[PDB]
Design a protein around this ligand. Structure first.
Ligand code: CL
Ligand code: CL
Ligand code: CL
Ligand code: CL
Ligand code: K
Ligand code: MG
Ligand code: MG
Ligand code: MG
Ligand code: MG
Ligand code: MG
Ligand code: MG
Ligand code: MG
Ligand code: MG
Ligand code: MG
Ligand code: MG
Ligand code: MG
Ligand code: MG
Ligand code: MG
Ligand code: MG
Ligand code: MG
Ligand code: MG
Ligand code: MG
Ligand code: NA
Ligand code: NA
Ligand code: NA
Ligand code: NA
Ligand code: NA
Ligand code: NA
Ligand code: NA
Ligand code: NA
Ligand code: SR
Ligand code: SR
Ligand code: SR
Ligand code: SR
Ligand code: SR
Ligand code: SR
Ligand code: SR
Ligand code: SR
Ligand code: SR
Ligand code: SR
Ligand code: SR
Ligand code: SR
Ligand code: SR
Ligand code: SR
Ligand code: SR
Ligand code: SR
Lengths: 56, 237, 92, 194
RNA sequence: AAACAUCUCAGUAUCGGGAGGAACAGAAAACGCAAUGUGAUGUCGUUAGUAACCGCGAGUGAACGCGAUACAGCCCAAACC
RNA sequence: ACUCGUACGGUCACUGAAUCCUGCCCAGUGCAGGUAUCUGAACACCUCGUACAAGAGGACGAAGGACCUGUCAACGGCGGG
RNA sequence: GCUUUACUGCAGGCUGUCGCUGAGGACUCUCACUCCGGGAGGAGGACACCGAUAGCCGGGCA
C-alpha cells in the first residue's frame, strides 16, 4: 500500500476545528488545544518573535 | 547514535508498562492490632494474572474480604489464621519468631509489617533455619542466608503452582500470551542484528560484537550491555 | 665530544683574558607566580582551554651545547652560542 | 544604652553558637515539614526586619521561603555545541537564592509587593529566607509616611524587575565607581556584559 | 579565525517573567587630571580604537576627565522618649 | 517505568526445534577478585618562604594502575620451522 | 550519518574530602537525618541521602 494516494483515503478524522477564542480553524478537538492562539494551553495569547523577520 | 531499547524502557511508555488495570490485588499480609484473634475462611481460589499462579479469596471474622498469597494445599472452606498466636499449619501467617525452625515459609516480609517481599513466585519457598531474640536466619529461594527481624511476618508452606517452569512453551504463541500479561516488550531482537546506530553490537559485514561483552559496572546507560560486570563467563573451570 | 673544564679565554666583564670554569646550565625551578601562570588559571574553564590544552612538543635529534662560562677571578659568568653536540663530557 | 534589638542582632552574627544554635536545630525540624512558602505572624529576626522597613501594622506581611541549595539544575545540550557550551555540572545561575526566594513569595501573594528580605539559615540541602511584603491597597499603608511610596504604580511587581535590595546588589549596582561600568544604569542597557 | 578547539559571530537570534508612558539609575564606604582639586543619576559630543584583553593570532574594548543637556535633593533603622 | 512484580522472578546479552556433540588456548584486550610492597588527587596537617598571601617541599594515601589470580557458550586465536 | 586504544571535551559510575553533623586507627551512644509501621513503636544512624570539590573510568554523548 503506497504512502501516497491510496493512504489518503483513510483520512476522515476531525482534528482541527474552529476555535472558540480566536476564530481560526485551529482548535484541535482531540487535544483541546488551539495551535493558533494557544487556547486550552495558556491564558496568554500564543505569540513568538520568529513569526516575523528579526529586525521587524 | 540512538538510545538503545533498554533506555526506551525507562520512560515507562505503554509498550513497556504492565497491564496494571487488569491486575487483581496486592497480596500483602493483613494488619492485625495484636492478639491474633483474626481468622478467616477461604471463600474461593482465583487466578492471579500478574503471577501465573493461584490466589485465595478470604473472608475474615471482622467482615474483610481480601485476596491472599496462597501456599500449596489451600482449599475452599479451610480456615486460616493471622497473628502472633496463630496455629502452626499451612496457610497461616505469623512472625518468624513464632515459627518453629526448619519450616518452609513464603511471602516473607523484609521489614516487619511491610506485607511480604520474599518467596512469592510459583512453587518457591524460604526455609526458616535459625531463631534468636535479635535475628531470624532464613534461606531464600536463591540459596542466600538472610538475616531478618524475628518480628518479620510470613506464611507457612510453599507457594502454590510449583513446577510451572517444568513445561516448555513449545511455541512462540504461548510465550506471546504470557508476555501480554507482563510489563515486558517481547519478542527480542539481538544487538548484533541491529545497525551500529542502534546498539553497541550493531554494524559489521557479518554479525558479531566488535568488542568484549563483559562490561564494567561503571559504564553509563546506553553502553552497559552484554554481560554486566561478570565475575566470569562460560561454563569452563 | 670532550670539553676542558677550565681554560683561558675572554671575560667580557674583566675585559681581559682569564681562566674560566665551564658548567652545564642547570634548570632553575619555577615559582608558579609569573604572568603566564596566572593566565592559565584565569583562562582555563569548562571545555577546551585553547593554548592551555596543548601538550609538550617533541625533541630534536641532537641539542646544542648549553653552558655557563665562569671567570676565575671576578666570579661572574657569561653565555655563548651553543653548537650541536650529541654528548659533552668535561676533562677534569 | 543598647536596644533589646541589638541582642537579636548579636545572636545572629553567629547562628552556630549559643542559644541560637539550639533554637535553629529545633526549628529547622519543623521548617523542613512546612511548605515552600509559609506566612508567619512575626519576623524571626526582629532587628533585621524593622531595620529593612518592617512595622507591626496592617498591610505588612512576613513569609518564610525555602529553596534547594547549590548550582543550576540544568539539562545537558540536546544539540551541537562547541566544548565551551557543553558544561552542565559547574554552571550556576546568575540570580542568587535569596532572589529566587523573594520571587516565589511574591508569586504566592499576587496582590502584595516585596519590600525586602533576609536570611534565616540553612541546613545541608536548602536555605530559608524571610520576606517582608506590603499591601499597597490597604489604607493603613497608603497613609504611612515611611511606606506609602511602595503604593505607586511603577512599584508593581518590583521584585520581578530587580528593584529589590537583593535585586540591586545581585545586579552589581552596589559600587558607584570602579567596577560598575557595565552594571549602571542597567545590565541590559550595557549589552548584558556586567 | 581563509582548517579548528580558546577566541569570534554574541550576551546577538530565540525563550521565560514583569512595569510604564516612558523605563532603569540616582544623593558617594564616589573620584584619585594626587589636589589648597571635583561633588547624586541618565544621556549626547569627546576622551579613543587610547588603557586593558587575546592560539599576544583573528579579533574584542572601557573609564576618570572635559564640553554639553537637565538639574534636587531627601526618608528610615537605632540612640532618647 | 519495571512493579497489584520478588530468584519457578526480571533485567542484560549470545546461540537458534529435536538428535549426536561442543576439543586446546587466560599471553594481549575485556570483566571480576585479591594485593606485602610500589605508584596514586584534593581538604586537613607539618617545614621553608611571606609581619599575611602567592609559592616550594614533606608526611599520610581512597578508588585506579603496577603485581597476582579467576574467567572463552568473553573479545578473539588454534601458524611457520 | 557511522566507528575507534584519532584530537579535545561533556554526561554518567566508582572513590576521597568539606558542609548537613550531635554526645561519650579502632569503638560506644542518640538527638539531627533515613527507612519500616495505621499508630504506639521498630530498624538504622552521624553513616546514608543531598550540596561542593578532588582522582579514576568514561564514543553513552558533543
Ligand atoms: Cl517467561
Ligand atoms: Cl651542554
Ligand atoms: Cl513585588
Ligand atoms: Cl576631578
Ligand atoms: K563556534
Ligand atoms: Mg501483594
Ligand atoms: Mg504488553
Ligand atoms: Mg532474538
Ligand atoms: Mg541489517
Ligand atoms: Mg553505537
Ligand atoms: Mg550467526
Ligand atoms: Mg555469530
Ligand atoms: Mg518621622
Ligand atoms: Mg537607559
Ligand atoms: Mg573558520
Ligand atoms: Mg566569551
Ligand atoms: Mg591562525
Ligand atoms: Mg565583546
Ligand atoms: Mg576611572
Ligand atoms: Mg537466523
Ligand atoms: Mg515512604
Ligand atoms: Mg562522534
Ligand atoms: Na578571566
Ligand atoms: Na506579588
Ligand atoms: Na575559512
Ligand atoms: Na571545516
Ligand atoms: Na583568546
Ligand atoms: Na581640565
Ligand atoms: Na587471554
Ligand atoms: Na550522511
Ligand atoms: Sr508490509
Ligand atoms: Sr491501492
Ligand atoms: Sr479513518
Ligand atoms: Sr492545558
Ligand atoms: Sr509570546
Ligand atoms: Sr507491596
Ligand atoms: Sr502497603
Ligand atoms: Sr557488530
Ligand atoms: Sr571448556
Ligand atoms: Sr575566568
Ligand atoms: Sr578545561
Ligand atoms: Sr624528533
Ligand atoms: Sr502583574
Ligand atoms: Sr546638580
Ligand atoms: Sr540444536
Ligand atoms: Sr585475561
Amino acid at each position: 500500500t503506497g504512502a501516497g494516494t491510496p493512504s489518503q483515503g483513510k483520512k476522515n478524522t476531525t482534528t482541527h476545528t474552529k476555535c472558540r477564542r480566536c476564530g481560526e480553524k485551529s482548535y484541535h478537538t482531540k487535544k483541546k488545544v488551539c495551535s493558533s492562539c494557544g487556547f486550552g494551553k495558556s491564558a496568554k495569547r500564543r505569540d513568538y518573535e520568529w513569526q516575523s523577520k528579526a529586525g521587524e | 547514535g540512538r538510545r538503545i531499547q533498554g533506555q526506551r524502557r525507562g520512560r515507562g511508555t505503554s509498550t513497556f508498562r504492565a497491564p496494571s488495570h487488569r491486575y487483581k490485588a496486592d497480596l500483602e499480609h493483613r494488619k492485625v492490632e495484636d492478639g491474633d484473634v483474626i481468622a478467616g475462611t477461604v471463600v474461593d481460589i482465583e487466578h492471579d494474572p500478574a503471577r501465573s499462579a493461584p490466589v485465595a479469596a478470604v473472608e475474615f471474622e471482622d467482615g474483610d474480604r481480601r485476596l491472599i498469597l496462597a501456599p500449596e494445599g489451600v482449599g475452599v472452606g479451610d480456615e486460616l489464621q493471622v497473628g502472633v498466636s496463630a496455629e502452626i499449619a499451612p496457610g497461616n501467617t505469623l512472625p518468624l519468631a513464632e515459627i518453629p525452625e526448619g519450616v518452609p515459609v513464603c511471602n516473607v516480609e523484609s521489614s516487619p509489617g511491610d506485607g511480604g517481599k520474599f518467596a512469592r513466585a510459583s512453587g518457591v519457598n524460604a526455609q526458616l533455619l535459625t531463631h534468636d531474640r535479635n535475628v531470624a536466619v532464613v534461606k531464600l529461594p536463591s540459596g542466600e542466608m538472610k538475616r531478618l527481624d524475628p518480628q518479620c511476618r510470613a506464611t507457612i508452606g510453599v507457594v502454590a503452582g510449583g513446577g510451572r517452569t517444568d513445561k516448555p512453551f513449545v511455541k512462540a504463541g504461548n510465550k506471546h500470551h504470557k508476555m501480554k500479561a507482563r510489563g515486558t516488550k517481547w519478542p527480542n531482537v539481538r544487538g548484533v542484528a541491529m545497525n551500529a546506530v542502534d546498539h553497541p553490537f550493531g554494524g559489521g559485514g557479518r554479525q558479531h560484537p566488535g568488542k568484549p561483552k563483559s562490561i564494567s559496572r561503571n559504564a553509563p546507560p546506553g553502553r552497559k550491555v552484554g554481560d554486566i560486570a561478570s565475575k566470569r563467563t562460560g561454563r569452563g573451570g | 665530544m670532550q670539553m676542558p673544564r677550565r681554560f683561558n679565554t675572554y671575560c667580557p666583564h674583566c675585559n681581559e683574558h682569564q681562566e674560566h670554569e665551564v658548567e652545564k646550565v642547570r634548570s632553575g625551578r619555577q615559582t608558579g607566580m609569573k604572568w603566564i601562570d596566572r593566565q592559565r588559571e584565569r583562562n582555563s574553564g569548562i571545555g577546551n582551554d585553547g593554548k592551555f590544552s596543548k601538550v609538550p612538543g617533541g625533541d630534536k635529534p641532537t641539542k646544542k651545547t648549553d653552558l655557563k662560562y665562569r671567570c676565575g677571578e671576578c666570579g661572574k659568568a657569561h653565555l655563548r652560542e651553543g653548537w650541536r653536540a650529541g654528548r659533552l663530557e668535561f676533562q677534569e | 544604652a543598647r536596644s533589646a534589638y541589638s541582642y537579636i542582632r548579636d545572636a545572629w552574627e553567629n547562628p552556630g553558637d549559643g542559644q541560637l544554635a539550639e533554637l535553629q536545630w529545633q526549628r529547622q525540624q519543623e521548617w523542613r515539614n512546612e511548605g515552600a512558602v509559609e506566612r508567619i505572624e512575626r519576623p524571626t529576626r526582629l532587628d533585621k526586619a524593622r531595620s529593612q522597613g518592617y512595622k507591626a501594622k496592617q498591610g505588612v506581611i512576613v513569609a518564610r521561603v525555602s529553596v534547594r541549595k547549590g548550582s543550576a539544575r540544568k539539562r545537558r545540550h540536546k544539540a551541537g555545541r562547541r566544548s565551551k557550551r557543553q558544561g552542565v555540572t559547574r554552571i550556576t545561575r546568575r540570580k542568587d537564592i535569596q532572589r529566587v526566594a523573594e520571587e516565589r513569595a511574591s508569586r504566592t501573594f499576587p496582590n502584595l509587593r516585596v519590600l525586602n528580605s533576609y536570611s534565616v539559615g540553612q541546613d545541608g540541602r536548602q536555605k530559608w529566607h524571610e520576606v517582608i511584603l506590603i499591601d499597597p491597597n490597604h489604607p493603613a499603608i497608603q497613609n504611612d509616611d515611611d511606606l506609602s511610596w511602595i503604593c505607586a504604580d511603577d512599584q508593581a511587581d518590583r521584585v520581578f524587575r530587580g528593584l529589590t535590595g537583593a535585586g540591586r546588589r545581585n545586579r552589581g549596582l552596589s559600587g558607584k565607581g570602579k567596577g560598575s561600568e557595565k552594571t549602571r544604569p542597567s545590565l541590559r542597557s550595557n549589552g548584558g556584559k556586567a
